[PDB]
Design a protein around this ligand. Structure first.
Ligand SMILES: CCCCCCCCCCCCCCCC(=O)O
Ligand SMILES: CCCCCCCCCCCCCCCC(=O)O
Ligand SMILES: Nc1nc2[nH]cnc2c(=O)[nH]1
Ligand SMILES: Nc1nc2[nH]cnc2c(=O)[nH]1
Ligand SMILES: Nc1nc2[nH]cnc2c(=O)[nH]1
Lengths: 38, 178, 261, 247, 247, 247, 261, 38
């Protein structure tokens, strides 16, 4: 970090995070893979 | 039928004719295939040059509650021609889907590839197989229900799916100043 | 890395992973380990290049305009927006809200339509509401509090970093709403786009012959946070101040439902 | 797990064939916190007068009906005290339990897409002009064709916002498959780039109901199959009292 | 306990209205042990190439159709790699998951007997001669009459083997009652007097599907009601490699 | 250490004057590991039906015969169950014990080069066209001249791949010197840039047999001196079942 | 370092290091310490410069083409391959499989066939399947996700690093196989060569006179792993998409077997 | 190492490894230099 400003920094490409649970299964009642859906 | 709603629905009927003919058939590679290049799987895949992992096809049956049936959805890896009979198609990774209360089925295409990645563009070296659908038995409907139903298809990636080499999408095709 | 494939065997039981209900708004979480018999394979494949920082983190052209040396065609003005060019627009119109700070890189190439001495360029940025110059000897150009870049040709392109200068907690690619409270006036994302004009001119006073420079601005988003994903654009980009479109086919056609190459 | 009940502010909703409620993006709505707020004025929180089920006008679903869209919060104006607190306040939040319900027999078939799209910025029918505000907001209908004029481009393949209509599955959504369920409940937390926003000039989301498989039935079955939308804001709070706006 | 799934060697079977699978005589099939074996040669065990679901040709079930029979293992020749390992090997075992499936509406009625009979030694139509091998093995149909000629006696009351057809319930069997289930799954361990036997000249069992209650439906229901047989060998192993036999 | 025996899957090989077997690049073949695999499907491992000695057609070795080449795995198609598992599967590995054997008297002289070359990408006879697939695959013969046409350039000095034929010693190879040995056994692990590859469209290696010292004998000795190739895949495994390919 | 030579003396025994059998596929491991009498010498010679990293690790020219400023001759296209030039081809056609990641260095020299202002060049790389530009005002040139290098003349040559972008576990110099599964179509290594086209143009809009630039791409392999060595090429390199050849003498001739200079 | 990417690194020229045993003597039965070949 050669600059004080945070916008004047390298892109944080290294970090890898993900939460696909908020898109693929956003349902309230938990749905088990094994069990029937209903 | 493309600039309409009839592009999404797959015509499935009850009859005596053409029960030894496929219901549908298309390329399994989601980048260049004229069926699933536009899906959310294919839209995010066309920004990339390489892709790996299993895709899965979910089939929602949009008929009546009294109409029952069984369907054979099969995947056959490349090397041979398209399966032309249900006998040749039940040799690939298939599923016999009984239609009832659940009314939905997932065919997981199991990623049978020679290499670790495949090209999104169409090249012979890394080409995916074929996804054909067949009548396992038939669609059977009561006297008063409508005899022509249709299956609605879905496609998404599995948890081991990954894309590998960034490129520009060919869809936008800007002509000039906006 | 991505998830490994667990080994499975022949199964005959009252459990049904394949049977789902799409009408639950639920995407099935099944793997090929649930449908068929699989071997144990160790996936060393990573999803490092599909992240939003790697996807959006490439410098895309956002603005091209000419300005001549030796009137109002002597300098350029952009009134900053992403919507000038189609390829970066489709990446930014893919997320509803997205929060990033960008560095811009200019590629300034002068071309003769008698010998140019050397060309030095000024890229002055006025934040919204500032004084705009109407001439090259404007008086606005002196940058007491406006940021400005001076660049002479033959050097590295001018790269400077910009912070997240939006009023809201995120930039909005789409604004389904009006400008006035009576539901009147300007519709769409134009209302939210309050980022100042960008003024580019030759600080050379004149030239013996007509020299036309063109500038190419390349935004590269970094430190990117994106919310509420939406499908990519299908139909082209007729306008810049509105998402207007001619209706287009959803997908390329076939001859039959069974027809395949 | 097919029967369900929702009770909000003296109004309950009964369903017996339904999928489970879908929570938009996995976040349940709530009141605005003290650290994410921006207006130093005590907000109005009428939890039982506004946060209750409001039933919109039902629409007839036919064999060739393309679809419908509503624009909320605005569609809920002049409806109960939720619309009165819009006219007197400048800011607002809510969380909109959306209960779309469409019943049929076991001899009807069809499949609806009930999708909530945040910021469905529509497109004008003629590509070089702008259309009035009465075009956006009896819900507006899609068309299975191409319209022209000073209107929103209400074709169905391009769902109005200019995308593939099959790709609207990325948003929080359900399906009403008439063989499985007769209702679809979607819970939408407050989604915006700003902590509070005005409810009149800004449409936080639109509710698109699009039949992918059209309605079909033989002779003798009931032809009139209506679709009813029952939307209930949740955790609604208001800020910025002033004189009532005339809209 | 009505929904069930069977996954064998990249081929799964989905059923949602079914009785539970019937294990023939309470023994699940397995590989041949070292103490009950007879051939000192390393057997071929291609567990995923042969032990998978093979779908036979479907047959139309009519109001007056008497019945059908297949003869296995032979019926599975020239079908996939299970038939290729027959032609190159002299010995063989398997365990034959038999999944017979026949769907209908709630306005159709009928009742099938799906019975697996080990060693269904048939009888000739004319009592003093012998009939060719093409008579035994499009499955052969029974007849609701008495045939004559150089054929298998395919009357239904005497099921071909010369017994009472109602007394075929002693064998491992299920029923497809169209009001209850639309499939019948029978698991058959390797039943023979010998540890391994040739698959061509010997028919270990035959699959008889006999409608005790005939198919009936009023006008408007679908007349074409097909019966599909999906047989999958299990724990198949081979011994005695040689040149391919031309049959 | 001159006598040796190789027993694979009910087929043994006896030699009494031979050099020791050469393991290609010092790696013995094996099954594909779980960390280096790419296809999540259970592979077919028929260890005794396919991994056994297959004997190709023998060729006559004359005083002026230039040489021969085979292209494997493809040369082993329609030969036993190793060729049947090619037609039904999409992927494949093996390890190919190659036993080339050529006997003579103590009054014959000559010296063969039995070399296995991975990826022997051949060259066309006319430098501006491409030649059919029947040219590559009765093994094709080299020529002690220059051919022209739509053919593979089968000159011997440039061994077809356009190198010095004396420099083919870098590959795993042996010599059959008729005074020392009458057989040459080469073991080739699975050599490819990919963990599994299709066996039809891709030729993993070619077997080149090139007499550096030509055959010579006086009158009375047997003129017919044949060269027999006995190739046996090892640790062969298959993936990707489908309908049989017609080739 | 290499192995030292051990001292030996006069030997008369039943052991025979010189006697071998080549027909065993075995190269004899004998030293001069086994055949003759030797002194003890300490070899400080190393094999550091014969390694694959030092041998292949030098930048070799792989592509030259012209593109003019002020049609389709306005920009260059390469469809990347090693086979364009003969000297690096013979080093890469020496190993069957080889896994490396390369950095490319461009040498761009503009020459006049009235004064050029300054020339800035763009080297855009499209991965396979991307949109190709058919014009200089293509619209493809804006590089939203394509990598691209902008270079103005008079500076250091543009060097950027490239990863191992192959689908397989190694690049294949040779592919003895077909393109289609029916053994049809394209034969050889062309089928495997799926690396995108390389597009080079002047970002200067025009010029008062005809200026022709030429580009020289220099791959230098690094982090090199090579498998299955094969003999070097004898006969020349008639084609680029196939290993086709005219038959040539294996070695230079003499007049007699005893004849020596 | 001034870059995060591994391909954006110096060439590892320093390391010197070799295994000539997999080319010169790939035979199964070990062959002693002293002993006769057969
Ligand atoms: C010489 C000084 C240059 C300073 C330039 C300031 C640039 C302003 C920041 C760019 C605006 C980004 C807007 C993105 C909105 C969206 O994603 O829709
Ligand atoms: C401006 C961006 C430039 C990016 C250029 C990417 C170059 C692709 C990698 C080079 C391909 C190497 C192929 C070697 C194959 C072989 O060894 O036969
Ligand atoms: N009733 C209810 N309250 C919550 N608070 C946070 N999550 C929830 C939820 O899912 N249901
Ligand atoms: N999967 C399974 N394996 C068995 N092994 C012995 N009995 C059984 C059985 O009933 N089911
Ligand atoms: N039989 C045998 N098995 C091995 N496994 C690893 N190496 C060898 C070998 O050399 N011979």
């Amino acid at each position: 970090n050669f600059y004080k400003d945070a916008a004047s920094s390298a892109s944080n490409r290294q970090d890898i995070q993900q939460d696909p649970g908020k898109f693929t299964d956003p349902v309230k009642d938990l749905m088990i893979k094994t069990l029937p859906a209903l | 039928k493309t600039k309409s709603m009839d592009a999404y629905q797959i015509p499935v009927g009850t009859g005596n004719t053409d029960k030894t003919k496929p219901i549908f058939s298309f390329q399994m590679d989601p980048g260049y295939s004229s069926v699933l290049k536009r899906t959310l799987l294919g839209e995010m895949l066309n920004y990339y040059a390489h892709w790996s992992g299993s895709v899965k096809l979910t089939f929602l049956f949009c008929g009546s509650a009294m109409a029952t049936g069984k369907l054979l959805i099969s995947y056959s890896p490349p090397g041979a021609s398209v399966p032309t009979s249900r006998k040749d198609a039940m040799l690939g990774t298939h599923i016999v889907w009984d239609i009832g209360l659940q009314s939905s089925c997932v065919l997981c295409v199991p990623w049978i590839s020679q290499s670790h990645y495949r090209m999104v563009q169409q090249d012979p070296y890394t080409s995916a197989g074929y996804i054909t659908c067949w009548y396992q038995t038939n669609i059977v409907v009561p006297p008063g229900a409508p005899t022509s139903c249709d299956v609605l298809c879905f496609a998404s990636a599995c948890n081991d799916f990954s894309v590998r080499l960034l490129r520009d999408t060919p869809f936008m095709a800007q002509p000039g100043k906006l | 890395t991505v998830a490994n494939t667990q080994p499975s065997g022949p199964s005959n039981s009252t459990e049904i992973p394949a049977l789902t209900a799409v009408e639950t708004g639920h995407t099935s979480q099944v793997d090929p380990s649930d449908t068929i018999q699989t071997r144990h394979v160790v996936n060393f494949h990573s999803r490092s290049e599909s992240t939003i920082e790697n996807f959006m983190g490439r410098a895309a052209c956002v603005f091209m305009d000419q300005y001549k040396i030796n009137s109002t065609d002597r300098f350029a003005v952009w009134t900053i927006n992403i919507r000038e060019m189609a390829q970066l627009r489709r990446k930014c119109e893919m997320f509803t809200y997205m929060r990033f700070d960008i560095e811009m890189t200019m590629v300034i190439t002068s071309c003769q339509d008698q010998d140019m001495p050397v060309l030095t360029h000024q890229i002055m940025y006025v934040p919204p509401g500032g004084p705009i110059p109407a001439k090259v000897d404007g008086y606005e150009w002196q940058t007491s509090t406006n940021p400005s870049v001076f660049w002479t040709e033959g050097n590295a392109p001018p790269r400077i970093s910009i912070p997240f200068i939006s009023v809201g907690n995120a930039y909005s690619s789409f604004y389904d709403g009006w400008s006035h409270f009576t539901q009147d006036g300007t519709y769409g994302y134009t209302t939210l786009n309050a980022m100042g004009k960008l003024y580019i001119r030759h600080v050379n006073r004149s030239s013996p012959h007509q020299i036309t420079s063109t500038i190419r601005v390349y935004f590269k988003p970094k430190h990117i946070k994106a919310w509420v994903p939406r499908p990519p654009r299908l139909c082209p980009y007729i306008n810049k101040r509105d998402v207007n479109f001619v209706v287009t086919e959803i997908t390329d056609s076939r001859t039959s439902i069974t027809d395949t190459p | 797990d097919r029967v369900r009940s929702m009770t909000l502010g003296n109004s309950t909703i009964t369903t017996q064939e339904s999928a489970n409620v879908v929570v938009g993006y996995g976040e349940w709505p709530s009141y605005l916190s003290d650290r994410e707020a921006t207006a130093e004025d005590q907000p109005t929180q009428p939890d039982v007068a506004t946060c209750r089920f409001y039933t919109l006008e039902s629409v007839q679903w036919e064999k060739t009906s393309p679809g419908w869209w509503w624009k909320f919060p605005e569609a809920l104006k002049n409806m109960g005290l939720f619309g009165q607190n819009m006219h007197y306040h400048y800011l607002g939040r809510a969380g909109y339990t959306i209960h779309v319900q469409c019943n049929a027999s076991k001899f009807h078939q069809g499949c609806l897409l009930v999708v909530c799209v945040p910021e469905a910025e529509m497109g004008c029918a003629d590509t070089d002009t702008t259309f009035p505000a009465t075009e956006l907001t009896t819900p507006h209908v899609f068309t299975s064709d191409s319209i022209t004029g000073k209107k929103v481009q209400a074709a169905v393949c391009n769902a109005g916002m200019g995308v593939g209509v099959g790709n609207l599955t990325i948003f929080p959504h359900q399906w009403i498959n008439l063989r499985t369920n007769n209702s679809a409940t979607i819970v939408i937390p407050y989604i915006n780039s700003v902590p509070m926003d005005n409810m009149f000039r800004h449409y936080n989301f639109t509710l698109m109901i699009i039949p992918f498989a059209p309605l079909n039935f033989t002779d003798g079955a009931t032809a009139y199959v209506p679709i009813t939308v029952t939307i209930a804001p949740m955790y609604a709070e208001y800020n910025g009292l002033r004189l009532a706006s005339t809209q």
